[PDB]
Amino acid sequence: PRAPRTYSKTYSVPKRPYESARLDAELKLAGEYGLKNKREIYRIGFQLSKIRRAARDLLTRDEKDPKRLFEGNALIRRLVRIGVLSEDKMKLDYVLALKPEDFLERRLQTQVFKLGLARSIHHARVLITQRHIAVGKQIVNIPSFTVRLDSQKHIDFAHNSPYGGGRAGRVKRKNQGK
Amino acid sequence: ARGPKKHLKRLAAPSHWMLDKLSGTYAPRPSAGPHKLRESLPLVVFLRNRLKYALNGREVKAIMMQQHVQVDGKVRTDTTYPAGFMDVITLEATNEHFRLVYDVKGKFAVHRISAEEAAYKLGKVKKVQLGKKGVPYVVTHDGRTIRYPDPLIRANDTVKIDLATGKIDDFIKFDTGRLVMVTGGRNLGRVGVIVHREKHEGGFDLVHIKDALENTFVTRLSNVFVIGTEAGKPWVSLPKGKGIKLSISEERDRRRAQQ
Amino acid sequence: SDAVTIRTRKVISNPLLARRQFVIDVLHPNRANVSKDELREKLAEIYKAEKDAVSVFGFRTQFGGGKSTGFGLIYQSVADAKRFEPAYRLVRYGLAEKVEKASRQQRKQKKNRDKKIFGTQRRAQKRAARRNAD
Amino acid sequence: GKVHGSLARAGKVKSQTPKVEKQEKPKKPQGRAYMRLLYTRRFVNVTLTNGKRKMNPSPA
Amino acid sequence: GKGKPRGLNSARKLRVHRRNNRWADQAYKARLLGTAFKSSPFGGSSHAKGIVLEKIGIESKQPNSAIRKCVRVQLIKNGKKVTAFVPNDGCLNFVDENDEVLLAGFGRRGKAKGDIPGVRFKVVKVSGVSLLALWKEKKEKPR
RNA sequence: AGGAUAGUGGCCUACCAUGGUUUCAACGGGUAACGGGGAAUAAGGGUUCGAUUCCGGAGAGGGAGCCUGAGAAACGGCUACCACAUCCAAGGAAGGCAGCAGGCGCGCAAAUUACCCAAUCCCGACACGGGGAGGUAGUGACAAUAAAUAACGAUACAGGGCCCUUUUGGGUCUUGUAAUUGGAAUGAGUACAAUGUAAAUACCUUAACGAGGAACAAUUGGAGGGCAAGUCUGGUGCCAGCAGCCGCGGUAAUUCCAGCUCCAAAAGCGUAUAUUAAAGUUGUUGCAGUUAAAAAGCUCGUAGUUGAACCUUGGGCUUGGCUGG
Numbered sequence A: 001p002r003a004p005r006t007y008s009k010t011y012s013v014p015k016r017p018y019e020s021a022r023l024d025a026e027l028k029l030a031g032e033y034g035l036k037n038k039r040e041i042y043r044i045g046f047q048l049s050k051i052r053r054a055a056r057d058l059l060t061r062d063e064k065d066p067k068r069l070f071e072g073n074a075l076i077r078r079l080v081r082i083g084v085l086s087e088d089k090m091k092l093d094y095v096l097a098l099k100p101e102d103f104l105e106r107r108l109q110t111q112v113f114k115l116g117l118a119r120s121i122h123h124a125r126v127l128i129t130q131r132h133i134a135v136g137k138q139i140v141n142i143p144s145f146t147v148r149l150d151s152q153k154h155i156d157f158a159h160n161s162p163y164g165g166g167r168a169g170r171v172k173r174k175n176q177g178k
Numbered sequence B: 001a002r003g004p005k006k007h008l009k010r011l012a013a014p015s016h017w018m019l020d021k022l023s024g025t026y027a028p029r030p031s032a033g034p035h036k037l038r039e040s041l042p043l044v045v046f047l048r049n050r051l052k053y054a055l056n057g058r059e060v061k062a063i064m065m066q067q068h069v070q071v072d073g074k075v076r077t078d079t080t081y082p083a084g085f086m087d088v089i090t091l092e093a094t095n096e097h098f099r100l101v102y103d104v105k106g107k108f109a110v111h112r113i114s115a116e117e118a119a120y121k122l123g124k125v126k127k128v129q130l131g132k133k134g135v136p137y138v139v140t141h142d143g144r145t146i147r148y149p150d151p152l153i154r155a156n157d158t159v160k161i162d163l164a165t166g167k168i169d170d171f172i173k174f175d176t177g178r179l180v181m182v183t184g185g186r187n188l189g190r191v192g193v194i195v196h197r198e199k200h201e202g203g204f205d206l207v208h209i210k211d212a213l214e215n216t217f218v219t220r221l222s223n224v225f226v227i228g229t230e231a232g233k234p235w236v237s238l239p240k241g242k243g244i245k246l247s248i249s250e251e252r253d254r255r256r257a258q259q
Numbered sequence C: 001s002d003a004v005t006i007r008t009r010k011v012i013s014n015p016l017l018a019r020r021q022f023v024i025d026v027l028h029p030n031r032a033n034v035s036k037d038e039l040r041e042k043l044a045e046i047y048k049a050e051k052d053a054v055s056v057f058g059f060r061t062q063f064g065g066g067k068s069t070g071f072g073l074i075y076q077s078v079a080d081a082k083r084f085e086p087a088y089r090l091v092r093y094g095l096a097e098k099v100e101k102a103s104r105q106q107r108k109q110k111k112n113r114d115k116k117i118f119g120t121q122r123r124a125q126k127r128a129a130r131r132n133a134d
Numbered sequence D: 001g002k003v004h005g006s007l008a009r010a011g012k013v014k015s016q017t018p019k020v021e022k023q024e025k026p027k028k029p030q031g032r033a034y035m036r037l038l039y040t041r042r043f044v045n046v047t048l049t050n051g052k053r054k055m056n057p058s059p060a
Numbered sequence E: 001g002k003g004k005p006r007g008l009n010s011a012r013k014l015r016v017h018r019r020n021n022r023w024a025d026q027a028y029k030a031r032l033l034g035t036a037f038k039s040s041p042f043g044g045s046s047h048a049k050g051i052v053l054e055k056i057g058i059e060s061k062q063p064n065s066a067i068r069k070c071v072r073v074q075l076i077k078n079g080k081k082v083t084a085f086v087p088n089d090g091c092l093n094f095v096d097e098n099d100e101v102l103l104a105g106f107g108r109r110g111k112a113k114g115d116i117p118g119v120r121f122k123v124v125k126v127s128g129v130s131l132l133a134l135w136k137e138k139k140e141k142p143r
Numbered sequence F: 001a002g003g004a005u006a007g008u009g010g011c012c013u014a015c016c017a018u019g020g021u022u023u024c025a026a027c028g029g030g031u032a033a034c035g036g037g038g039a040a041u042a043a044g045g046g047u048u049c050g051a052u053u054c055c056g057g058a059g060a061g062g063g064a065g066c067c068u069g070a071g072a073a074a075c076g077g078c079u080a081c082c083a084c085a086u087c088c089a090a091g092g093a094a095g096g097c098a099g100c101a102g103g104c105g106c107g108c109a110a111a112u113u114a115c116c117c118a119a120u121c122c123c124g125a126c127a128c129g130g131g132g133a134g135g136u137a138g139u140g141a142c143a144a145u146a147a148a149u150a151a152c153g154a155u156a157c158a159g160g161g162c163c164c165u166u167u168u169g170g171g172u173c174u175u176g177u178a179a180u181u182g183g184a185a186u187g188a189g190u191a192c193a194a195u196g197u198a199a200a201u202a203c204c205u206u207a208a209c210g211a212g213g214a215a216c217a218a219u220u221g222g223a224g225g226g227c228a229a230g231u232c233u234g235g236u237g238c239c240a241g242c243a244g245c246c247g248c249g250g251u252a253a254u255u256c257c258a259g260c261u262c263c264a265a266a267a268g269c270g271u272a273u274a275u276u277a278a279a280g281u282u283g284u285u286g287c288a289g290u291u292a293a294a295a296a297g298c299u300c301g302u303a304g305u306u307g308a309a310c311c312u313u314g315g316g317c318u319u320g321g322c323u324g325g
């Protein structure tokens, strides 16, 4: 038959289901970033847990090792590219010091609210889900869309949105048309 | 298993064709021909995946049935014909001549050549022996049989094929200092000069090859193809990159400067 | 409003099939999309070719609308186009009539029914008729 | 072990439990909104009593 | 020297000794002996269908005092007879003689649970309808 | 030595020797055993699995024997027997779904008797024919990805936050409450249409329609401990039942049956079974053996395992590549 198509899981659950310290930390963290459920926090922790594992393996190698230099710099460059890592902390020791709030800062939901286009973070998600926000000339309706540094300046209302110069929406047309 | 296989699973195709996983269940099974199945390039892959002249397998058959494609100066209509190393492909409608030479990345490069260079080819001598009525002959890497060769020609030498009469113009003796491209193994596509030939009776002889950057690698004698009488003097035009292998860090640096 | 904009990229001249082939980018703001028939008319005017020598297919609209990407062919003549085209595209363009045949079940059942007859059908049915003296 | 017994009392308590209908109460928010409701209730308007914090205080 | 060989060429003694001594692990014995395949009423399956033979009722163990309401079921796959508990308040009234019931374990993986003596299975479905659905009046028994 | 084979060969025959394997486990038995690439889990070391997208092998109900052919001991080829089993005018004849779909049976356990060669490729005398190979759709909560179920105001009212200020009385800006009040936004759905396709469906785009209880209404398990969340209300009263384990139930039950409230995960949640970590409870890393389980009654002893030290060191000379600076 045809070749299999690869797929993989993008999250992992905690070993202890009930722990007040972790439950309170997650809910406090979900409320700050307007997340739908706990799985969106597990997803960040999962990809950060494997970033650390990659960093540990390179750190055991000698400095100036060809693999450590190539993949370590590439991983740092990618993290700097998405704005998670600062430009003055490209040492692979600050990579281990990264925290989940660094990643939630770079979501589309966080940037829409932090750019003043929305009143609150929960307004940001519904704006995104309702096809109002466009990055560049492309409409993006994924709240977890990770904004790159060069894409940061191009977040604005969609050109065909009611809030960004488009026509009036369904509700207004029904009222003013009577 | 009661007989010869006639299909090729997509996953089982040679990796240097660079076929995608999900385009279908099967891959083009190269026909019997001058080149081995694993070391060939079917014309369907060349006309559709490489040149992208044809959009699908139906179109490559339409191209070849109008007599456009010539391999080594003869019109070929077999869509899965196993073209191989040093083969010449002529499309006089587009006025293009190609030679199948490996690039340094291990794949068959799209190497355009002039019409003057497309009038001959090189073949590695596999064996020299006597035929019926005591007539000596040479077998090249593409299955060619040339009678009455120069009596100095021996195995592992390279001959220059007139490619229109099939005769030998001249040859290169296998010896230290000859220019070589590697046609097998993980050093496939690299170009260098012979530094030292290490003999092993009953086993496999090993050849030490020095890159233009004075990088040394070892490969089996069966993967050695003599292409020049000395360094910097190849008998055919080399593909872009000149068969010099760069490390991934060097490639990243070169790519950064180019862009 | 309208202002349909057409861009061509990856253009390859293909005298092997007597045609030019390219990727088509269509910019249609304030417009759901552009029909293949309307693209063929526009493409003929832009490149001064016969409308029947232009073939477009495989279009998809990007997310949010306002832009589509496809593939296009322009032949040197209508005769060349009719020779090197799939049947279904010529039926799309009206250059051919959809061939009418029975379903695959009927063709296969008829093929297997004829497999039980050796010789001409006229001989087989005349002999079968003779057996059924009725 | 000795195993036997009258089967006549099966479902005794559930059968005689007085049926009480659920009051038609407002729907709770779903999805992201419910996480928003819980977050404020636990970190914005804290209802603790000098160190005594209860999620479900019985009326007392 | 820790009572086991340490020489670099003593891998055979170490491999055989470990192989010999894993037989003391009862979990290991059941996997290789195939005891679930040979001895278990389910034959190693998670579930098994059967026919209810009779409603009887089992007295609970001390210090508890109650009537655990079970059924006697003859398995279709091998004809063996087992006792299966009928969970929840009054679900015994949903199960009649000569009904087809789907069984599952009690979750203690072959041992009895709680005060119920000698019962290792529970009733999951009757007549192809979930017993839980019957208890919560989501569905009605097809009869 | 011959015969046979495409060919080596006890492959077979004639004659002749007495050899061949084995405690470094032969031989035999079992396998709920096709092998591998690989899968699950994983600090390290490991444990468990691999019928199944690729490769190799084997089979076409069970055996055996063959024809044709380069290639088959082929089974959508034949011959014969066994077991099943079809039509019959009773003389005879014809079978093989572990191919696709479908049916019966088995079961805890698995979908349509659909469309097509347009793509991927294969076969043929072949640019043209064929292909249940293959592709498309149907069923599909196997698993996997992303991700709706609401957002923002207006006032009211409360607190904090400030400021006019001594407090007082205010102005006023941040939260919370509002059967307490609005106007915006959108896709689920549907739909002209275009795109998609061999033709369709669906997706993507997109006119018109499409949200206040926005009934366009999220569920599954729990609330004594482990383990997050009730000593609330009613019912029962060692009964009914719960309870993985410890335990709960004999008249205010923190555990049953319910109502309310709350907790956890959420388009998912629970149960059963297996397996992995936890397990340093299989321990090579890395267990224990006086008394918790466990030194053979004691010596000898073959295989196995394991075995004291010792043989060009030091010095000197030049010497490249690099790494503090």
Ligand SMILES: [Mg+2]
Binding pocket: A020, A023, A024, F228
């Ligand atoms: Mg809590």
Ligand SMILES: [Mg+2]
Binding pocket: B032, B033, B034, B035, B142, B143
């Ligand atoms: Mg050949």
Ligand SMILES: [Mg+2]
Binding pocket: B034, B071, B072, B142
């Ligand atoms: Mg040739």
Ligand SMILES: [Mg+2]
Binding pocket: C114, C115
């Ligand atoms: Mg016929």
Ligand SMILES: [Mg+2]
Binding pocket: C114, C115, C117, C118, C119
């Ligand atoms: Mg016929």
Ligand SMILES: [Mg+2]
Binding pocket: E023
């Ligand atoms: Mg034993």
Ligand SMILES: [Mg+2]
Binding pocket: none
């Ligand atoms: Mg025991």
Ligand SMILES: [Mg+2]
Binding pocket: E027, E028, E031
């Ligand atoms: Mg085990």
Ligand SMILES: [Mg+2]
Binding pocket: E031, E032, E033, E034, F031
């Ligand atoms: Mg077993």
Ligand SMILES: [Mg+2]
Binding pocket: none
């Ligand atoms: Mg007890």
Ligand SMILES: [Mg+2]
Binding pocket: none
């Ligand atoms: Mg009995």
Ligand SMILES: [Mg+2]
Binding pocket: E049, E100, E101, E102, E125, E126, E127, E128, E129
């Ligand atoms: Mg049942």
Ligand SMILES: [Mg+2]
Binding pocket: none
């Ligand atoms: Mg012999």
Ligand SMILES: [Mg+2]
Binding pocket: F008
């Ligand atoms: Mg022989």
Ligand SMILES: [Mg+2]
Binding pocket: F031, F033
């Ligand atoms: Mg086994």
Ligand SMILES: [Mg+2]
Binding pocket: F033
């Ligand atoms: Mg088996």
